Assembly symmetry: C2
Homo-oligomer: 307 residues x 2
Amino acid sequence: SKPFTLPILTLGELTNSRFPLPIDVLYTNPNESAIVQCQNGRCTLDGELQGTTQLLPTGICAFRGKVTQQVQDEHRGTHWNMTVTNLNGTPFDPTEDVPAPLGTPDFSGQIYGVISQRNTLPANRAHEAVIATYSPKFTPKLGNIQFSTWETQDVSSGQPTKFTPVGLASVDANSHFDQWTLPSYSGALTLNMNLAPSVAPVFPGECLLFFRSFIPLKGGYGNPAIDCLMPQEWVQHLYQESAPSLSDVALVRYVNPETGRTLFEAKLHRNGFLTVARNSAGPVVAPTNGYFRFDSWVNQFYTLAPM
Amino acid sequence: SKPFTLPILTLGELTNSRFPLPIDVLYTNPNESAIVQCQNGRCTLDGELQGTTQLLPTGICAFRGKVTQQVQDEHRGTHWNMTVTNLNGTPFDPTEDVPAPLGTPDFSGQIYGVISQRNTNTVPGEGNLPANRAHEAVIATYSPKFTPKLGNIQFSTWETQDVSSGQPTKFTPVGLASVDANSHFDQWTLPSYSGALTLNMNLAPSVAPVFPGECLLFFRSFIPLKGGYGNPAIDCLMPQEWVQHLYQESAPSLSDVALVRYVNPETGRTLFEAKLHRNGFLTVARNSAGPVVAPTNGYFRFDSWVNQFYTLAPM
């Protein structure tokens, strides 16, 4: 039976699976009231990608498609309707068992990035853009979304278009940033489907352990973060290896390789998430050389050493 | 001896190691006159990173640092100097044996992206949260003010004033600003990392075929443009995932040349074979330039260790 492994990568060698950002810190928040059911960075320990998860770091929160119409906002700015395809350019088939095109953002907010176009030597243009994933017009599962620009005219219809994500536009009240609220992939009156399951601790005194990244802002006040369940390199590694899961919970140890000492241990659950025995919120303070190593398979009743 | 392996990844599951882009096609250009000596996407088969190569896909052509002030420049736009640190935020030590901070761009051009800032100082009335701003920006890597090995670079903005002095600053690369002749795009021309008239150091070595009839094989990506005409590309020697895999495995190289086969897993047939050289690059027996037109399910599989005298089947 092919032994289960994790890559050997410090935090400073990992990237977020929910937005294109380096991992900054490990993080807990036991009092979280929201259901945690993110759709990017979802992979079982035996290498089954779930939700909208795909392998490319460049595909996370990306879109490809073509613009079809300009629609002026009532007050300021300009909106553009965009038909979206799969990231590989093939038509998105809404009958496939996925929530939305792979890579689609998995949270409510105003996602800031750049729209670029290369016409079918060709002409090109790029501009800053914002995608409001809570908008009624955000319907990627139906094959269409809308983005807005500060630029008022120089976006072409019927030409190949790329969205490269950069950060958030705002985290003000009216910008509806909530990293645990899913978009309505087909619009507000329709249920999302084919979702990766929600995740939670099941044992008293445990809480989720996240890989946290701070996300840039176009403007305003804030220090927003995006928390993923596993970094993108772990998704990539599990997919490659596809090791059989020998129980429902792996025990992993966060080790300092210089000293050989274990700093703490965590449960790595079959569906692809970590819990720890910690009763506080905030960053985990740990040496920069540290990383997780698989120890053994255990079960739901295993008691983790407190942090 | 730990067996050598490549990941199992189709072209549509690979990304470029020289710019944050998916791999679009395999590509050859036998009559290339330039010396091929890129500094990102450099890794030996036994896992030794070279040049300015680092592991993060978010680190490629990225910078972290602090704006100092707006500066004068004769060129169009508003210009800003920024100090640069290592990508992990630690001070860049110019005495380390690297050409420049890891992730620094390795080609001449006008790199287009976004500069973003999050202030250090916070406001009590705003919940002790900091102010932020971001704007489109261009870094001309051929500029005499592009001196990353000295810990400083310059970028230009269309925005004329809303960039703050002394505040933490990130550059997120997106594409190129232009490929007109006056924008000096040349993917095989290295920047001068310490400025005009200085010699670069600590470079990963140049790469070339050393067997008649062979040429380099590249993983090509098309790079976005802010404006103007063009369909520019960036060619890497190995995708970022191969750098990441080789670093993980660190398998001993049992000769100077690994034979690999590009396979269609559907039919299990070999489309062509290639040499994967110790220093981290591929050659094939091909006598034309342009894309390699191959099934989308295709990937390289390690076959065996051969040597420099092995003759490849023509593509």
